[PDB]
């Protein structure tokens, strides 16, 4: 399709822990989403919320429609569960690495389905609970999902980082090692 | 033994081009798209046997069709114009750095307009041998990344961008 | 106004 820009509303309902997400992406970049537990709009960047204001009830309404469609589709599809797709993980820094200069490490998980996964950051073998940020399960054209994980860190030659991704399609938990 | 899990998703796509909005509404069950509305067609369509009864009922209701036919202007066009200054005109100045890591790397970071072109220059002479560039890396932060390699022989990296009125060089 | 619009998805025929 000839398109200078693409604006897409993406939403999924499922059985496991991510029961529902309702987002809106512009050129494969999420602009806002509704937090269904909080019933409020969440803007990806603060500059978005100052200019626009999205009605949260629209997202809750769409998720309620998709939930009815899921139950209807489960019986019509005779309880068919899709085959699990192993994810592809790549870890890269946001900025060129400079020792002592704060940087953000990005763990990109791509081409996985279903969008149910356990992801943790490991710095020198220990779990990092602070400075971690996770993106939503962003959609893909092949109807798979991809997710971003972020970790703010200060580079050091001694420190080594690992991105632990657990998925049903993975035979074993996958760890992507990154160091300076 | 993957646990029991059933998924249902959907896409409401607005395609903008030459001042024209084309609306697509997909109905997907476990990666299997079974129904679709196309503003060019003007009605629903069954992608597989799974969604035939659904598309036939939607096409039988005139108001369901009329609501979807008004989407290109009510939603696709309106959201395209309202978000224009924050989406179309979103400009970020790229930061360029060159490092030796013999190959030379020109790492360009923090630029939102994805379209960007990078050229190596040796003593004022652009080289095209041994030059391999990574594909555009989306950081998921509305910021992009790209690295260009260069097979050099030891004895400047210029970048052109929409946000940049004058190309930036790093020596 | 200053708000983006949304369109109801439809319910599959039961």
């Amino acid at each position, epitope marked *: 399709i000839k398109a200078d820009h693409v604006s897409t509303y993406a939403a999924f309902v499922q059985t496991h822990r991510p029961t529902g997400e309702f987002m809106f992406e512009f050129d494969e970049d999420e602009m806002f989403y509704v937090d269904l537990d909080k019933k409020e709009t969440v803007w990806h960047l603060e500059e978005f919320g100052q200019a626009f204001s999205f009605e949260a*009830q629209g997202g*809750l*309404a769409n998720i*309620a*429609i998709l*939930n*009815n469609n899921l*139950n209807t589709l489960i019986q019509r599809s005779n309880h068919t569960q899709a085959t699990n797709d192993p994810p592809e993980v790549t870890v890269f820094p946001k900025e060129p690495v400079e020792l002592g200069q704060p940087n953000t490490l990005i763990c990109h998980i791509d081409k996985f389905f279903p969008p149910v996964l356990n992801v943790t950051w490991l710095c020198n073998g220990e779990l990092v609970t602070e400075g971690v940020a996770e993106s939503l399960f962003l959609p893909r054209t092949d109807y798979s999902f991809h997710k971003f994980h972020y970790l703010t860190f200060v580079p050091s030659a001694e420190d080594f980082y690992d991105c632990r991704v657990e998925h049903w399609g993975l035979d074993q938990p996958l760890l992507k090692h990154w160091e300076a | 033994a993957t646990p029991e899990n059933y998924l249902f998703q959907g896409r409401q796509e607005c395609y903008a081009f030459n001042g024209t909005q084309r609306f697509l509404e997909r109905y997907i069950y476990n990666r299997e798209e079974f129904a679709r509305f196309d503003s060019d067609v003007g009605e629903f369509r069954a992608v597989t046997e799974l969604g035939r009864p659904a598309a036939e009922y939607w096409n039988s*209701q*005139k*108001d*369901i069709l*009329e*609501e979807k036919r*008004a989407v290109p*202007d*009510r939603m696709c066009r309106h959201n395209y114009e309202l978000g224009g200054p924050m989406t179309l005109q979103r400009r970020v100045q790229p930061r360029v750095n060159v490092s030796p890591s013999n190959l030379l790397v020109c790492h360009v970071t923090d630029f939102y307009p994805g379209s960007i072109q990078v050229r190596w220059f040796l003593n004022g002479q652009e080289e095209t041998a041994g030059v391999v560039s990574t594909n555009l890396i989306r950081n998921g932060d509305w910021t992009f990344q790209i690295l260009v390699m260069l097979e050099m022989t030891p004895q400047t990296c210029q970048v052109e961008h929409t946000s940049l009125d004058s190309p930036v060089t790093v020596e | 106004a200053t708000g983006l619009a949304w369109e*109801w998805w*439809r*319910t599959v025929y*039961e």
Partner: T-cell receptor
Amino acid sequence: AQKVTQAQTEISVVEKEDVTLDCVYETRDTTYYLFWYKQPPSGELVFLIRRNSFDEQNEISGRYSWNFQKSTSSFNFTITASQVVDSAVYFCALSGSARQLTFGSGTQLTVLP
Amino acid sequence: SNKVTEKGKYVELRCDPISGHTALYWYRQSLGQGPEFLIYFQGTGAADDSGLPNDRFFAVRPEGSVSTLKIQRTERGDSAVYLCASSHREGETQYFGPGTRLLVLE
């Protein structure tokens, strides 16, 4: 916002006369749906009409009439020949972006004998 | 039906929709005024635009075959006629049931 206004509080006519109950819908939706409901004494809300936003051609088609004027944003219910059984409270409803109904106030018709 | 309840007691109201209707709506009508929207059910879930009055008002529809509006800590002001309408799909004509008149007495 989405609101329905029926300013006629009470209408009194003898039988075989003509009456016209009025609404003025007030919604921002692009596609809306208007309804008329009848609530007889100690009775349920009976369905009478549903005219969608796109269908604009008006008809008489019996004793019950409806004139959907998008210009005035009005929707007027007209009864040709009044019978004492038509004596009830009639309601104006509006739907669309909100799938539930935005009922108006009350118009009580009393067909006298 | 018609319900009478002493102030404070817990009440729940029942509504059986028509068969294939996937859309259930609760309305409340007070003093013959305009019916007020309460909650909108679409199958097993609530797509409501949240006309529910307080935290004391909650509703469920486990299988889409029947909804139950629950009122804890009944107050006199909660006394009204609670209507119930069902739509075949999301957007079809809604047909109201007889409703249950709630009355909260001191």
